[PDB]
Amino acid sequence: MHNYNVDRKYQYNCRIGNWSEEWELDEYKMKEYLKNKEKQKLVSTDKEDRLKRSLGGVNLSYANEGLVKFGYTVMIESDFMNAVVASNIWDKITGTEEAYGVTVTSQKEPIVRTAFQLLRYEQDQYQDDVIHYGQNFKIAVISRLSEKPLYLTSSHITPQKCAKFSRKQEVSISTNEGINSAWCFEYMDPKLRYEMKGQPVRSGEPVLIKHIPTCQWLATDNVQYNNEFGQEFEVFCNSYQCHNKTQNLIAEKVGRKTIETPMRNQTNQNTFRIVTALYP
Amino acid sequence: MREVISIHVGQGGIQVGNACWELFCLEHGIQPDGQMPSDDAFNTFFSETGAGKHVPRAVFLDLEPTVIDEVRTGTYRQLFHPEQLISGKEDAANNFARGHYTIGKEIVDLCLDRIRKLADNCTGLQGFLVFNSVGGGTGSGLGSLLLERLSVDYGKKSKLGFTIYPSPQVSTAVVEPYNSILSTHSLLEHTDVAVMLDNEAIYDICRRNLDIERPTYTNLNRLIAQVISSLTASLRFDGALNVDITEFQTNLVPYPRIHFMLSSYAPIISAEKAYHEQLSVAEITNSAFEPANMMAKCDPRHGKYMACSMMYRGDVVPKDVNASIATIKTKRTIQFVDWCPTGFKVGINYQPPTVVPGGDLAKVMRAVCMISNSTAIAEVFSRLDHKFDLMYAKRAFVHWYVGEGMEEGEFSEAREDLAALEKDYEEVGIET
Amino acid sequence: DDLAITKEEVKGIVKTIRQKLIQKTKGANDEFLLRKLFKEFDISNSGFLTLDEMNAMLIKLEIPIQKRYLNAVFSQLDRNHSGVIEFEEFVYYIVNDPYP
Amino acid sequence: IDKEFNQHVIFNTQGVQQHILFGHGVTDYNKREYGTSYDLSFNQKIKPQTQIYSK
Amino acid sequence: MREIVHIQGGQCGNQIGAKFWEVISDEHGIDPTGTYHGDSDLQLERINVYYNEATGGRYVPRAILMDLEPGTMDSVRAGPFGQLFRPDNFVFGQTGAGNNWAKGHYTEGAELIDSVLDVVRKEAEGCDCLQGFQITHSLGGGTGSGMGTLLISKVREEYPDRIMETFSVVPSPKVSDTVVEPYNATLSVHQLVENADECMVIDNEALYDICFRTLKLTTPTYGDLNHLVSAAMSGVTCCLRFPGQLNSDLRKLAVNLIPFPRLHFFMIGFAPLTSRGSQQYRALTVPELTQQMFDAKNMMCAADPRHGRYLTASALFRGRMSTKEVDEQMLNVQNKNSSYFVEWIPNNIKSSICDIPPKGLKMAVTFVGNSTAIQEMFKRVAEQFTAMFRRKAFLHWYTGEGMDEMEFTEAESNMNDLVSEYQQYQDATA
Numbered sequence A: 001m002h003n004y005n006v007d008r009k010y011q012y013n014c015r016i017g018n019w020s021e022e023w024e025l026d027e028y029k030m031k032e033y034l035k036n037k038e039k040q041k042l043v044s045t046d047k048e049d050r051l052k053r054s055l056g057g058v059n060l061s062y063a064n065e066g067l068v069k070f071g072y073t074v075m076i077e078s079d080f081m082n083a084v085v086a087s088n089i090w091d092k093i094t095g096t097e098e099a100y101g102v103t104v105t106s107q108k109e110p111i112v113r114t115a116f117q118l119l120r121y122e123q124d125q126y127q128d129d130v131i132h133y134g135q136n137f138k139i140a141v142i143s144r145l146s147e148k149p150l151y152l153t154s155s156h157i158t159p160q161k162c163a164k165f166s167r168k169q170e171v172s173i174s175t176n177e178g179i180n181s182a183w184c185f186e187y188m189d190p191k192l193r194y195e196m197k198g199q200p201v202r203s204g205e206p207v208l209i210k211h212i213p214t215c216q217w218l219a220t221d222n223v224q225y226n227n228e229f230g231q232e233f234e235v236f237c238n239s240y241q242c243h244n245k246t247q248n249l250i251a252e253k254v255g256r257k258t259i260e261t262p263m264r265n266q267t268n269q270n271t272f273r274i275v276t277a278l279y280p
Numbered sequence B: 001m002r003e004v005i006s007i008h009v010g011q012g013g014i015q016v017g018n019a020c021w022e023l024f025c026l027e028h029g030i031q032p033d034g035q036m037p038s039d040d041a042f043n044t045f046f047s048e049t050g051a052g053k054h055v056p057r058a059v060f061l062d063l064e065p066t067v068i069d070e071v072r073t074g075t076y077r078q079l080f081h082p083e084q085l086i087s088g089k090e091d092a093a094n095n096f097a098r099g100h101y102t103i104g105k106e107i108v109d110l111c112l113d114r115i116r117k118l119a120d121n122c123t124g125l126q127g128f129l130v131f132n133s134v135g136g137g138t139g140s141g142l143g144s145l146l147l148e149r150l151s152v153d154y155g156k157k158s159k160l161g162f163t164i165y166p167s168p169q170v171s172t173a174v175v176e177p178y179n180s181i182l183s184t185h186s187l188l189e190h191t192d193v194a195v196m197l198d199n200e201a202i203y204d205i206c207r208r209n210l211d212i213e214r215p216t217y218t219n220l221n222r223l224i225a226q227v228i229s230s231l232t233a234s235l236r237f238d239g240a241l242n243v244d245i246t247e248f249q250t251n252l253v254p255y256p257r258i259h260f261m262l263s264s265y266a267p268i269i270s271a272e273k274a275y276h277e278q279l280s281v282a283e284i285t286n287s288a289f290e291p292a293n294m295m296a297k298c299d300p301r302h303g304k305y306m307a308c309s310m311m312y313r314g315d316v317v318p319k320d321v322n323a324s325i326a327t328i329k330t331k332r333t334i335q336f337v338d339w340c341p342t343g344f345k346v347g348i349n350y351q352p353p354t355v356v357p358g359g360d361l362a363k364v365m366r367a368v369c370m371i372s373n374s375t376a377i378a379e380v381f382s383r384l385d386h387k388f389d390l391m392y393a394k395r396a397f398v399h400w401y402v403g404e405g406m407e408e409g410e411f412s413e414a415r416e417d418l419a420a421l422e423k424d425y426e427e428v429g430i431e432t
Numbered sequence C: 001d002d003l004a005i006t007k008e009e010v011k012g013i014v015k016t017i018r019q020k021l022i023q024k025t026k027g028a029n030d031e032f033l034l035r036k037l038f039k040e041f042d043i044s045n046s047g048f049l050t051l052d053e054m055n056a057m058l059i060k061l062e063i064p065i066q067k068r069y070l071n072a073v074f075s076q077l078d079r080n081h082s083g084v085i086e087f088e089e090f091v092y093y094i095v096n097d098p099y100p
Numbered sequence D: 001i002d003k004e005f006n007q008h009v010i011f012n013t014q015g016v017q018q019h020i021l022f023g024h025g026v027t028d029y030n031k032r033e034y035g036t037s038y039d040l041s042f043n044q045k046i047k048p049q050t051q052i053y054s055k
Numbered sequence E: 001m002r003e004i005v006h007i008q009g010g011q012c013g014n015q016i017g018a019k020f021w022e023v024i025s026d027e028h029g030i031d032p033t034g035t036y037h038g039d040s041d042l043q044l045e046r047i048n049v050y051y052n053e054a055t056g057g058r059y060v061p062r063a064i065l066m067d068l069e070p071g072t073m074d075s076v077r078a079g080p081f082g083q084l085f086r087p088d089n090f091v092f093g094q095t096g097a098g099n100n101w102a103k104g105h106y107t108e109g110a111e112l113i114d115s116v117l118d119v120v121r122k123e124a125e126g127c128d129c130l131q132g133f134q135i136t137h138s139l140g141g142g143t144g145s146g147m148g149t150l151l152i153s154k155v156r157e158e159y160p161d162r163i164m165e166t167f168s169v170v171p172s173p174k175v176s177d178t179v180v181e182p183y184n185a186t187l188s189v190h191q192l193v194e195n196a197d198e199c200m201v202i203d204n205e206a207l208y209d210i211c212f213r214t215l216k217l218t219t220p221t222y223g224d225l226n227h228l229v230s231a232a233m234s235g236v237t238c239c240l241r242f243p244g245q246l247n248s249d250l251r252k253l254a255v256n257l258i259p260f261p262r263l264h265f266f267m268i269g270f271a272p273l274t275s276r277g278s279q280q281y282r283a284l285t286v287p288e289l290t291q292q293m294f295d296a297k298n299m300m301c302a303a304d305p306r307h308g309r310y311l312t313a314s315a316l317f318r319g320r321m322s323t324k325e326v327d328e329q330m331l332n333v334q335n336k337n338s339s340y341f342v343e344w345i346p347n348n349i350k351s352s353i354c355d356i357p358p359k360g361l362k363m364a365v366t367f368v369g370n371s372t373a374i375q376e377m378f379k380r381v382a383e384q385f386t387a388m389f390r391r392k393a394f395l396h397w398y399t400g401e402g403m404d405e406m407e408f409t410e411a412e413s414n415m416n417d418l419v420s421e422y423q424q425y426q427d428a429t430a
């Protein structure tokens, strides 16, 4: 008179009752796990693959006489976060075109995901390879991360497409090769922004990064975001100018100031640091 | 010069049309893609497009698109005319009222336009063939609407119905007696010749002879196809005694009200034991009249015989046919009616039967297809009337008819119409 | 050489192929219809189109282009110069492009 | 505390679910099979007795 | 193409539909990302039946999620396959029902039903040829049994022509989960006989019995429970999604199973159900199927189907089978069960065939029947209602929301009338 469900029960190891069914269920569960390991769809293999491809090694190119020139691999760092920018390809932005988010991260170790290349946007009168202030270029991702080239771009603010947290202008790594890649350097201080045009850009200095189609500066905040690679902040485009208004139009009419010279200070948020390699 | 137009309405009509036209396209040597390899005997069923392929003279009707688009994806997507596969949007759902009183008109007009176009090209149209299942809502309803529409569009033109009635006990639906009675009421005054095509009797034939425990509907469709081919080969193949379809309503119809009959075929054999048997003309004639060989669940021993049209194909001998007929008449257990001294109509064709690869039948040199009209056919009508009225007594399943737009009275007129038909059959059977 | 393929002719061809897919089935569809041929013949599942594959797709979708015009449009479409077209990129160009 | 190996226990030690119809299943049975009578009979021409034959 | 739209309210129907959509996505080869990676072309001709097509090449289920509280819906959006549903089909209240039928049907239900009615409308004119409606809910709770049935009445009002079926999780007297089922259970079942064209019943107690006796699984949860009910869900609509030798739509099943307008309550069963031991040990054959699918202990409600006579029955075979074996099995089981079947109608059994077996299976059978054994459940329901109504227990929170004893009395009388007219056919003779 073998009867099941007899109040207290032991493991399937004992023979009290209903042990065969439990043991067979356990066997078939690991046999399904055998199927999952036979066909390469393991979540563990996926996470390990992503982690290993994200954290590969890389060499930063050395800088001679501290002058940035096209083709080097350099680090881009927000000073206000004191942190280096990286890209998350695996996360997909909400858009018909394929674009991937970029976030700033405190850890500064040289990684493949954290490295970038500088490329000449369009042929220019400057034949020499030294980069200059106010010269358009395109930032490209390392060929190791993706065989296809990926460029950092932005498109004008729309209520249809606003940042998930910051709600402001987006920055996206996309396959677009259009004019949106046009990025330009700018020297930090208000007094000399205009006159620093046409001068070589040297590494290690506090610089500003501005988009051409929008004339917006790229910057970051203490804005929280979550992804695979720990906890990371946001990078976007916005004008963090000082709030007080100045009579630029009336200064124009009187004739004291001309538009190209700026008059409004911008906060420390907007600063960015180019980082080269320590040793050759 | 001579053509016959085929109509396939209802799901069963569709699945029998597929098999029949596969059989005909193989036996005519035309590929499924539609053009003759080239490495006037087709004008009856196929029509030249002018250069290359051949255009079907067939029409397909159904209210549910699964079978139609399945055929459109099948091997004959390159064969069939595009919009002669007329498909609806909503299935009639086994309801005669749905197919006859609400949504049948949105499709019957298109079908009549199509048949105008097909008949206009044809110059020597011989008649119409109709394929449908009685125990299906859309089948019965659309077959009805088509029959009264063509009855006033043409009139005297001949039509033959290879129709599938529900089996006595082997049937799928519960409400099939209703639409069966209504379909019979619709067709008994509009169909020149109608044959029985129930399924379980032929299932028994297959189990007995082919020795199979597991056949399906495909074999049924194939064998019905072979019967149709045997019947229609006389119009397109040379023979010593050619019989036209017009010699059906003049030889198998003693009275206008009696036009229901049943078919049979011989020999049925597999490829394993065919070479070890005789298969003589006398034997295939004797087996054709064997009571269990009937394709319909009807016992000929319980009624008299009126007229049999039996046709041979192959290298048959008229003298041997006459000898077999003499032996049949000599046998006592088959008895004819007194007022019909001669009741055999024989035709001879020289084309041997075709064999489809992958089918059950083997290659044979002689074959006979027989169509018999007998007074014993009233048994199926009586049993269907019982299955009707037992559940008809207390207004069962009636409101899905009446609230659809059907009037409640028509079942009555069907009842006394079938009663008068049965009285006609049992009055004819008496001796004079 | 008889002639080189001209930009306005390229625009005409792309407009024709761009309009042809609209006529079939419904408005929201034609994306699944284009994807479905790629599923039908992309055996390796890698996601890369080729010259002959695109020729086949055009032949299926009632568009017999010249070999030369097909090479011209292929070259215009690809900048990688690898002789392979990403299916999603081709779909985005043909279907979602504000510019003619 | 388990974190990574917690996948193993949730997968094999009574997670509050059941795994993808594998209780309903039938040596290896995913074997999603499909073929309709028309799609098999009249086109590739396999013998009607040789169809069915459940396995 | 004769597409059907899904609606579900309350956490019960939410779970049922969530797992049903997982089953359908698995069957059709749709990833939780909504992108198709099937193997056949045969999975794609009938995608429009359940999935609409959106930008990016993805598909969206045409389902509506309604509730008076957001907890279970936030759970389902976080669960697997939660990304298939559009964010617009979630509708939720901030109050909840609290197992109060009046709250879910009169005060909060009426004011909230406008949005859900609007969305179901726009989706309904979204489709070309609408086929019907299916609803999944539990009558033992507040929000479901109230708001769902109010939507039932409204939709039946604006669409008198279409067909509508509901899947009702009813309270079992043995397994008790709340103190006040009978009141709102009777209130809901009253409003079902007049509007629902099809209603089929599921019971937690008997479904537990299935899980613990047939499957013999040591510690079942709600997951495999919902898996069984979802398998039953999907087994009925196979012909509308796949080719078969005998197609049969929901209207055909209705007109072929229901004799009278007020007998539209149904009992369902699924086969082959087996324990985790004998999968490779028992041969899958039509005789074994037909034997198991008429086992009384295979049904999902406490009602014993041996205690009455079957009015109509239907079996929907899936997979490649010969038609004869089905036919003779049906007729033989009809003949040796003459005393257990009604006599005045002959051949009260439907056989339907679809040629696509389920995932991981070679054959399957879904049984739907209408029997005089279902009314025993309403005897328990009526006895409980009368006993707890005689002392006027818990009546006053209902009546403090615009209710009075008139509707309770009329619902009780109507349900007893239904029981009477359903039982008088049991002993009827022609």
Ligand SMILES: Nc1nc2c(ncn2[C@@H]2O[C@H](COP(=O)(O)OP(=O)(O)OP(=O)(O)O)[C@@H](O)[C@H]2O)c(=O)[nH]1
Binding pocket: B010, B011, B012, B013, B015, B016, B062, B064, B091, B092, B093, B094, B095, B133, B134, B135, B136, B137, B138, B139, B140, B164, B165, B166, B171, B172, B173, B199, B217, B220, B221, E245, E246, E247
């Ligand atoms: N001989 C034969 N009969 C068939 C076939 N298919 C269906 N039937 C018969 O048709 C009856 C049911 O009607 P169906 O043909 O299936 O369907 P319908 O006639 O289109 O009517 P609806 O079901 O309302 O769509 C069954 O009882 C069968 O006897 C077939 O392929 N061959």
Ligand SMILES: Nc1nc2c(ncn2[C@@H]2O[C@H](COP(=O)(O)OP(=O)(O)O)[C@@H](O)[C@H]2O)c(=O)[nH]1
Binding pocket: E009, E010, E011, E012, E015, E016, E097, E099, E138, E140, E141, E142, E143, E144, E145, E169, E176, E177, E178, E204, E222, E225, E226
């Ligand atoms: N099958 C099944 N039954 C459930 C589920 N959740 C709840 N139930 C049943 O529903 C009953 C309670 O219903 P309730 O939550 O009050 O319904 P509501 O008030 O409309 O939300 C319990 O007796 C359970 O048996 C589920 O996920 N699956």
Ligand SMILES: [Mg+2]
Binding pocket: B010, B011, B062, B063, B064, B091, B136, B138, B139
């Ligand atoms: Mg049909």
